[PDB]
Amino acid sequence: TLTFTNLTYWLINATLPPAMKYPGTDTTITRSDSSGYNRYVYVSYYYDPSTGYNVTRISIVGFTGDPTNYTNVLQLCNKYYSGTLYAKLVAVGTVGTTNYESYIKDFRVYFVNPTTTPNYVQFQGTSVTQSATGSVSIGPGQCATVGAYVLVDPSLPTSARDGKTVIATYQVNVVFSTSP
Amino acid sequence: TLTFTNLTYWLINATLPPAMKYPGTDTTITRSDSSGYNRYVYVSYYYDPSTGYNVTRISIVGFTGDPTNYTNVLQLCNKYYSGTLYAKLVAVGTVGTTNYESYIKDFRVYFVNPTTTPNYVQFQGTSVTQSATGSVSIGPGQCATVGAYVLVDPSLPTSARDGKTVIATYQVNVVFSTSP
């Protein structure tokens, strides 16, 4: 009774993500020992075909028995949007299982250039202990930087201390928006 | 044997359907990059003569490799009927064909302010995975808010990063009732 439909006409042509991911200066170390890899940070964005996402593979080589932090890791840096971007950080958890995840005692992610409310999501091994952060403004010209903080327990077997083997794989979901 | 008529008379009267459509607030984004459309959400309605329906046109911009969520798309509420309204959403299917519907993995339409039984209808490209939503109460004066959720597979061709061409449209019907 008195039911008239909608018949929406719903226009889509997705534009390039205006943030885009830049490797940063961490890949410019260009120097390494005889550990196989010539670079410590392998920042690369790859088209994921499994579920269709611009997933970015970046390598954060954390040194055993020593908490290591990084300053210039990732650039959330609007080049195609002419406004100011507002973003917050939420982490998901674990992907797969290397059976070495229990060896991590801390994994928190804090920026260097953008400074705001807590600005760190922190893992505790397999579990999670930090929910999310606040909003941060990223406009045209001013360019946001992402950091990290990695600590690894030194009880890891020497076989995995070579740097070839991947010890953990986590998901981080940064939600960039035009409003706070 | 014993056949007799009654000669009934039928009379029809015309008045405004109390449902009405409102453009929402996300259509006031009033901001756009070099994508042609000066807006991102469009709300319009035209009286189609082929079917005689007050077809309402809503346009939602998508982003490849990026889940899309909304807050205020349309407002549905009575302006002349004082009774307790009841609204549901029923999926219909694809209208037209852009040959790009395989790239639209998910598409969810949902209530925002009132929360009820599942309250989302999802589509898998051409196929429909959710039949319909449940009933929900709408009183005189307050208007329920309907949201939108879009997932776009970034396998979309680079020729489709402009904002003009149509890759996808979807239809959902709204059903009012005087009973729960």
Report whether B136 contacts B114 (CB < 8 A).
yes
How many Cβ pairs within 8 Å bridge chains A and B? 130
Q: CA dist B158 to A14, B136, B163, B165, Å?
A: 10, 42, 11, 12
Question: Other CB atoms closer than 10 Å to residue B34's CB: what's the count?
Answer: 9
For residue B169, list chain A residues with Cβ-Cβ distance below 8 A: 8-11
Nearest chain A residue to B92, by CA: A7
How do strand A104-110 and strand A44-48 relate by DSSP bridges? unpaired
Task: For residue A92, list chain B residues with Cβ-Cβ distance below 8 A.
Answer: none
Q: Which residue from B57, B172, B177 is facing A1, i.e. has the nearest CB?
A: B177
Resolution of the PDB structure in angstroms: 4.0
Q: Are A47 and B176 inside 8 Å of each other by CB?
A: no
Q: What is the C-alpha separation between A125 and A103, in angstroms, rounded? A: 7
Structure-token pair, residue A104 = 């991590």
Q: Tell me how close the Cα of B66 comes to any Cα of chain A, in angstroms.
A: 7
Q: How far apart are CA B164 and CA B162, in angstroms?
A: 6
Strand partners, A108: A122, A149
> How was this structure obtained?
cryo-EM
